[PDB]
Amino acid sequence: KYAYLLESTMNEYIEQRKPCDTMKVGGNLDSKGYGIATPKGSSLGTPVN
Amino acid sequence: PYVMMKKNHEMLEGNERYEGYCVDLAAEIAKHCGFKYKLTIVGDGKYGARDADTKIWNGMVGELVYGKADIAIAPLTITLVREEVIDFSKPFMSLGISIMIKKPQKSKPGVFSFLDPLAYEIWMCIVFAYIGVSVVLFLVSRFSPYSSESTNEFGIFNSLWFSLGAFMQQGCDISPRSLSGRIVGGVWWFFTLIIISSYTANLAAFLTVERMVSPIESAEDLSKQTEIAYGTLDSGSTKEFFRRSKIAVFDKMWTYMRSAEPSVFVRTTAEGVARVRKSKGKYAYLLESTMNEYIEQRKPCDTMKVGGNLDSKGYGIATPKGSSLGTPVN
Amino acid sequence: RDADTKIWNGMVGELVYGKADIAIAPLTITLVREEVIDFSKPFMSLGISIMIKKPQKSKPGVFSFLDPLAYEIWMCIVFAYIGVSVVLFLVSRFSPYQSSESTNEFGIFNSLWFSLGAFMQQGCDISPRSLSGRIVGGVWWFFTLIIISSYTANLAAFLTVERMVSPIESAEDLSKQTEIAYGTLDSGSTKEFFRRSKIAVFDKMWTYMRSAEPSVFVRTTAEGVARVRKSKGKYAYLLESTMNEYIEQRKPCDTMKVGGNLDSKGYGIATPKGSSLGTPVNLAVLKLSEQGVLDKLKNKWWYDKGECGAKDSGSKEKTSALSLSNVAGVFYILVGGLGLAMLVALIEFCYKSRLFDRGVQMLLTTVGAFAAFSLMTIAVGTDYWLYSRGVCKTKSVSEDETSKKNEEVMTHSGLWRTCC
Amino acid sequence: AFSLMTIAVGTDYWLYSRGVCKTKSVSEDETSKKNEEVMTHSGLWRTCCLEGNFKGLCKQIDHFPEDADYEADTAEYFLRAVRASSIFPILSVILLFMGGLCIAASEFYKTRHNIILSAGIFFVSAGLSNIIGIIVYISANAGDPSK
Amino acid sequence: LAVLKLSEQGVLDKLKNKWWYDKGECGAKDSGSKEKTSALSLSNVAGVFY
Amino acid sequence: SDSKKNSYSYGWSFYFGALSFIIAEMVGVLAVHMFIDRHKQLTG
Numbered sequence A: 001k002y003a004y005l006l007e008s009t010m011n012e013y014i015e016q017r018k019p020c021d022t023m024k025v026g027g028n029l030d031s032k033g034y035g036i037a038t039p040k041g042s043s044l045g046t047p048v049n
Numbered sequence B: 001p002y003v004m005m006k007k008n009h010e011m012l013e014g015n016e017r018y019e020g021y022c023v024d025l026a027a028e029i030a031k032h033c034g035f036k037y038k039l040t041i042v043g044d045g046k047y048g049a050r051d052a053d054t055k056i057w058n059g060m061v062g063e064l065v066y067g068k069a070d071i072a073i074a075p076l077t078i079t080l081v082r083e084e085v086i087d088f089s090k091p092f093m094s095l096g097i098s099i100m101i102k103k104p105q106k107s108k109p110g111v112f113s114f115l116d117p118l119a120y121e122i123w124m125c126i127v128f129a130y131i132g133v134s135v136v137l138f139l140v141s142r143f144s145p146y147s148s149e150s151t152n153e154f155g156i157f158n159s160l161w162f163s164l165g166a167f168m169q170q171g172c173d174i175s176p177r178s179l180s181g182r183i184v185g186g187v188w189w190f191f192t193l194i195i196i197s198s199y200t201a202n203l204a205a206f207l208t209v210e211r212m213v214s215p216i217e218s219a220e221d222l223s224k225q226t227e228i229a230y231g232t233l234d235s236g237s238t239k240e241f242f243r244r245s246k247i248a249v250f251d252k253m254w255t256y257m258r259s260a261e262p263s264v265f266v267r268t269t270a271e272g273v274a275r276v277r278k279s280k281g282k283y284a285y286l287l288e289s290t291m292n293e294y295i296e297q298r299k300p301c302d303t304m305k306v307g308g309n310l311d312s313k314g315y316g317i318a319t320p321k322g323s324s325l326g327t328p329v330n
Numbered sequence C: 001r002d003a004d005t006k007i008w009n010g011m012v013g014e015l016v017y018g019k020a021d022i023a024i025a026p027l028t029i030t031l032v033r034e035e036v037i038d039f040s041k042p043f044m045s046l047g048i049s050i051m052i053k054k055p056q057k058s059k060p061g062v063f064s065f066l067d068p069l070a071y072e073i074w075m076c077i078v079f080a081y082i083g084v085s086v087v088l089f090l091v092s093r094f095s096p097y098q099s100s101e102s103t104n105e106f107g108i109f110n111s112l113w114f115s116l117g118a119f120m121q122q123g124c125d126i127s128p129r130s131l132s133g134r135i136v137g138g139v140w141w142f143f144t145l146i147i148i149s150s151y152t153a154n155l156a157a158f159l160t161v162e163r164m165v166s167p168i169e170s171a172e173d174l175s176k177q178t179e180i181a182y183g184t185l186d187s188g189s190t191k192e193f194f195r196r197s198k199i200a201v202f203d204k205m206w207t208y209m210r211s212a213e214p215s216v217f218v219r220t221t222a223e224g225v226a227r228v229r230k231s232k233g234k235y236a237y238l239l240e241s242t243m244n245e246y247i248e249q250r251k252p253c254d255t256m257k258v259g260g261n262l263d264s265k266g267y268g269i270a271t272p273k274g275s276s277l278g279t280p281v282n283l284a285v286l287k288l289s290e291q292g293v294l295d296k297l298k299n300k301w302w303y304d305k306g307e308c309g310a311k312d313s314g315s316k317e318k319t320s321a322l323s324l325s326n327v328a329g330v331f332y333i334l335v336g337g338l339g340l341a342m343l344v345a346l347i348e349f350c351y352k353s354r355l356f357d358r359g360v361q362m363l364l365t366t367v368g369a370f371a372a373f374s375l376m377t378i379a380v381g382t383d384y385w386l387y388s389r390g391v392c393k394t395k396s397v398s399e400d401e402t403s404k405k406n407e408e409v410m411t412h413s414g415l416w417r418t419c420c
Numbered sequence D: 001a002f003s004l005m006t007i008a009v010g011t012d013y014w015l016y017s018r019g020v021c022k023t024k025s026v027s028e029d030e031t032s033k034k035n036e037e038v039m040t041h042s043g044l045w046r047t048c049c050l051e052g053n054f055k056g057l058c059k060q061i062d063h064f065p066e067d068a069d070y071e072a073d074t075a076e077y078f079l080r081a082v083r084a085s086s087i088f089p090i091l092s093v094i095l096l097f098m099g100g101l102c103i104a105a106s107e108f109y110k111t112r113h114n115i116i117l118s119a120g121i122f123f124v125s126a127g128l129s130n131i132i133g134i135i136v137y138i139s140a141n142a143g144d145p146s147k
Numbered sequence E: 001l002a003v004l005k006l007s008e009q010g011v012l013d014k015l016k017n018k019w020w021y022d023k024g025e026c027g028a029k030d031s032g033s034k035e036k037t038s039a040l041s042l043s044n045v046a047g048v049f050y
Numbered sequence F: 001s002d003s004k005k006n007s008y009s010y011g012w013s014f015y016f017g018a019l020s021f022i023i024a025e026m027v028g029v030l031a032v033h034m035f036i037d038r039h040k041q042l043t044g
């Protein structure tokens, strides 16, 4: 009787853990991303990209 | 639907002749960053690749590297070799390489679909066997029976009804009592045991069939069958993907495309969709999924997206390397 | 080698006489080639193999309706049919302790008709109508419910199955017949193999091939494939397995490779003696084989460039309508049953229009009792029940191992004794 | 019934199939290509092309086909041998005729009283020979491939 | 040279055919159902006869 | 193989036991017909 809204990567992870009693339904409502973050002006920023 | 010619292209001028998704996106970007713009089309109509043995970019990437264009509001896939020459923005749609086939036109179950487990020549010989048994069972029974004929209850018309009861498995009141009567009744019982049971066993097969829902379920299915050609858009990012991939299934798919004649590669997306529609399902076109959704949801509705996306990519706004507005577009 | 001039020819000659540096080629690793040029570790494995013409799909028979049940059960159904009809007669006809005898309508001729009717799932006119009569009728109903539901479980499948029937399954099966013809190449290492054969099977194969008219040997491999395809399944050609798999994957797709490889040999990259290339060529073969490149290059050229496409084409499955050819045997029996029914009605009409005895039937019973007692004692005593492969007096007792009882033999078993 | 069977065994519009025409009846030259499987009214003995430039030409059917790819088992051999000689439609025609002689010898040679019974047997037996001719005909048309 | 000479004379074959196959302790019969539509056998329905 | 290697076949001793069945059933029918016929002569 309860549906929880959370990010999809966590949601797929809880589904693959015991007691296996969760399910991910529906497509993603928004779309966002996880990205590697470097400080401004770091020389690493171009090879990390 | 990224860039289209507006229906009133003759009536309008300037930017107003174009309309589409990128047309709306370019307006929203320039509204935020305050710059005036003019929408143009790339000349060769190619997205952009390097020339082999000449090392010269073509297309929309080629216009940005060589300074002829300032910014690309386009379905331009963020790939490795493009990033080294031009900066991309953050992705604005997510997609992947997907497959397009012709939809198999489904055969509707007709109004007389119950006659399908047995052919149309076998029902005709059932009726000929039904007539033939009911007359022989008449000739046997009403045969100077030695008052004489009044004993058996098998005329012709009762014999047609006894034989009809044996076939539809419902039984009847009368039953043959002479020895030659019990032969023709006994053989027709064996006939109707096989044929009715061959019907019900095959009808279980026709009802519980799933159907020919996909000859291609996934990308490995394309790799194993050579009856069906598959190609990509020439000088695009999708062709560059199969060349550069070290995955075992994708290497087999590049081995097929490179060698096979006639050339499975197409010039534009509109040409490649047509080769699906004109090959009786023997050409599967590997295109981006966001183009594949748009073709699938429009008339004449004879294209089908099979399998998952082969990977995950993205479209990006592109400026030249170290251009003045690269950071505001991010 | 030329036998007298002692110069090498071929690609081995090109490497010895310094013309070439490496023989990336299907060159068989042999002893006499090894002594004059080095060989790599073999990049591909092969052996002598059997090529037979691909047999056409076995259509189901005329009598394919009785295929869901084995011929064991059909004979036991007939025995159970006669068994019930006699018991149902015997039960319903005793002297009831003058119309008391004539109550039940079950003679021997009606009781055959009740039992036939219950089995064919058509209701019959008469009913047992007595307690011991209904137990026979009740149990035969439970018999026919189980058997018919077992028979008609998958009756449509047994009418529409085709199976490829190999005439030959291996080299020993080709050894024990002369109708299908052997063949090898006239001038090759394969014919050399059957000269130097201390295996009794292969030596039996060689005495046949030498003494055979017309000549089973062919001058080229191209003619040997054509003699397979011409002689309509009566010719089997022996050649190396890598060629044999290649001809199978080419149109008209009417060849088949049967049996395992009779010998095992290899193809290796050949370098001249003392070449510096010999050590990296050895190590490059080993790098390709671990990476699966040699598995990938073989799976490309032999099967993926294949004109045949046998894998995907045989993989798709369909279920289709019954044809008249599939159940034509049922119609042959029916019209055969109708012609029999007219023939019986004529001969009984001529007999009625144109001498049973109690003493004659008494002599008939005495002979038949003795005839039944004679056949049953001869059956139990004498041991010719089953003809199958079994343990015989080679190693009838398990005295020593490895001997395998001549690998098996035909053995007429019995109810107690087995005899070979 | 005597007329309809003699007409049926006589004419050759039994089956409409993509048959091997007269041009491909012999393998005469290269790339004749059977006019890409031209429609053909095959029959009980004669297979003849229609609606083509080479229509109106006929040949006997190869009931035993050729040097093809078969071991020739006995069930297919006996089925081909029956349909080749067409013994079941021919036995139908003779059985229809003998009933025609009995029904002719009914009014004439009357009071024999069993001729009209025997004519019933010839008419029933001719029908049973007729359906056994139809079944072997349809079961012999499996050589048409139908993939 | 020793391995190649033993291979061509079938010695490596004869020693393999000896050691791997002479034991034969169980005929494993691991083929099983190579063909799918098996005819129903008497041992499966022998209880009905009983 | 799929009922192919052993290829079991039944010899003449098996079929005699089958013919010993069918004769034993025909006699058992005829012996009952006598027991009916002996009581047709017993009663009349």
Ligand SMILES: NS(=O)(=O)c1cc2c(cc1Cl)N[C@H]([C@H]1C[C@H]3C=C[C@@H]1C3)NS2(=O)=O
Pocket (backbone or CB within 6 Å): C041, C042, C043, C044, C045, C266, C286, C289, C294, C295, C296, C298
């Ligand atoms: N698949 S195949 O038969 O072409 C094949 C055959 C062979 C392969 C690898 C493959 Cl993929 N590697 C072996 C190698 C492993 C070591 C033993 C022999 C060489 C060195 N040679 S082989 O036994 O000749």
Ligand SMILES: NS(=O)(=O)c1cc2c(cc1Cl)N[C@H]([C@H]1C[C@H]3C=C[C@@H]1C3)NS2(=O)=O
Pocket (backbone or CB within 6 Å): C029, C030, C042, C045, C263, C264, C265, C266, C267, E004, E007, E010, E011, E012, E013, E014, E016
């Ligand atoms: N049949 S077997 O496995 O016993 C077997 C296997 C092989 C044999 C000989 C036998 Cl008997 N010889 C070959 C050898 C002959 C030449 C070809 C490859 C090496 C050099 N190696 S093999 O291919 O590994």
Ligand SMILES: N[C@@H](CCC(=O)O)C(=O)O
Pocket (backbone or CB within 6 Å): B047, B048, B075, B076, B077, B232, B233, B234, B235, B236, B237, B238, B239, B287, B288
């Ligand atoms: N998004 C692709 C489209 C062309 C293709 O699929 O190859 C590109 O810009 O290169």
